[PDB]
């Protein structure tokens with residue numbers, strides 16, 4: 001039956017059909033997941049972001065990502081993870097079900113924009129501390145992100161930082177992905193881009209890349225393709241040890257081993273004082289502490305790379321430490337088989353439909 005509670009508006013090519021409470025939709029984002037609109041929620045009396053997922057059950061690749069983002073957004077409640085305000089489908093039946101609409105708080109900026117500003121040590125360390133808190137919270141429920149990037153981290157005018165997405169799940173970070181959209185790889189750890197095993201501190205590499213960018217004002221490892229990405233890492237940080245090499249699959253290993261041998265540059269040369277606030281005693285010490293933290297996160301071999309907990313305890317970060325945010329109880333994920341399931345198209349359609357309905 002027609003439900004008078006919905007209306008339709010065309011945003012670019014695609015149509016949004018939303019509850020009438022959501023007014024004045026404006027497109028703010030696009031990508032592989034779907035279209036994001038800013039809107040005014042007349043019931044909450046605040047601005048929100050509405051993301052449309054089109055036919056998320058269409059194949060398992062789409063379905064696994066949609067499903068886990070629904071489940072996790074609903075069961076996580078943490079200052080540094082984007083919250084779910086609402087979720088709905090305009091279609092009225094399982095048979096007719098097509099689209100899912102995610103409603104989130106509308107944040108004021110993404111971290112790309114925040115990076116463009118000149119940030120003193122207190123602002124950089126606070127934003128990094130918050131990133132570490134959010135990552136630690138995910139890790140505590142066994143969720144390793146693997147794809148953290150500034151475009152998927154947003155910030156509020158009160159300085160609260162929130163991670164927007166939940167990462168690569170149990171997929172291969174060097175397997176083919178059918179998609180028309182560009183995929184940003186600048187922040188992915190060596191072990192991801194070389195197709196190696198990983199552990200929690202895979203996400204520390206990404207934090208290091210973001211921190212270095214915050215300081216320098218440009219992407220640290222802006223590879224124009226997979227080839228270039230690796231080249232840019234080794235040129236700056238040095239060729240990794242033979243022990244690390246022995247982990248690589250034959251084709252990758254021969255390539256990596258036959259690159260020119262780079263010594264790398266010191267973190268003092270990579271991140272000179274000129275790039276930092278450094279007009280005082282506090283600020284000069286802080287620059288050394290920052291380089292010390294970078295030198296522990298931007299480590300190619302993850303077995304020698306610092307952990308999230310160790311980073312939270314680092315003198316650059318720990319000035320902000322509060323166990324209410326840094327030692328929160330882990331998310332309780334209700335689906336005990338999250339990320340361990342293979343399903344047919346119709347099974348995924350019903351799982352995602354129920355998730356929307358809490359049935």
Ligand SMILES: Nc1ncnc2c1ncn2[C@@H]1O[C@H](COP(=O)(O)OP(=O)(O)NP(=O)(O)O)[C@@H](O)[C@H]1O
Pocket residue numbers: 028029030031032033034035036049051082104105106107108109110151152154164165
């Ligand atoms: N809740 C939100 N508050 C503010 N801006 C948001 C919000 N959600 C998304 N955005 C904006 O949308 C941009 C990209 O959309 P996003 O939510 O990442 O999904 P997507 O574009 O469908 N997939 P992808 O680009 O691969 O991450 C971000 O850089 C933000 O600028």
Ligand SMILES: *[C@@H]1[C@@H](C(=O)OC(C)(C)C)C(=O)[C@@H]2C[C@@]1(C(=O)OC)CC2=C
Pocket residue numbers: 114117122123124126127155156157158159
């Ligand atoms: C705000 C922020 C900060 O990063 O602000 C933007 C505008 C995003 C650059 C901090 O990192 C902490 C908290 C602060 C603030 O005004 O809190 C009320 C200043 C600061 C050091």
Ligand SMILES: [Mg+2]
Pocket residue numbers: 031033152164165
């Ligand atoms: Mg995203």
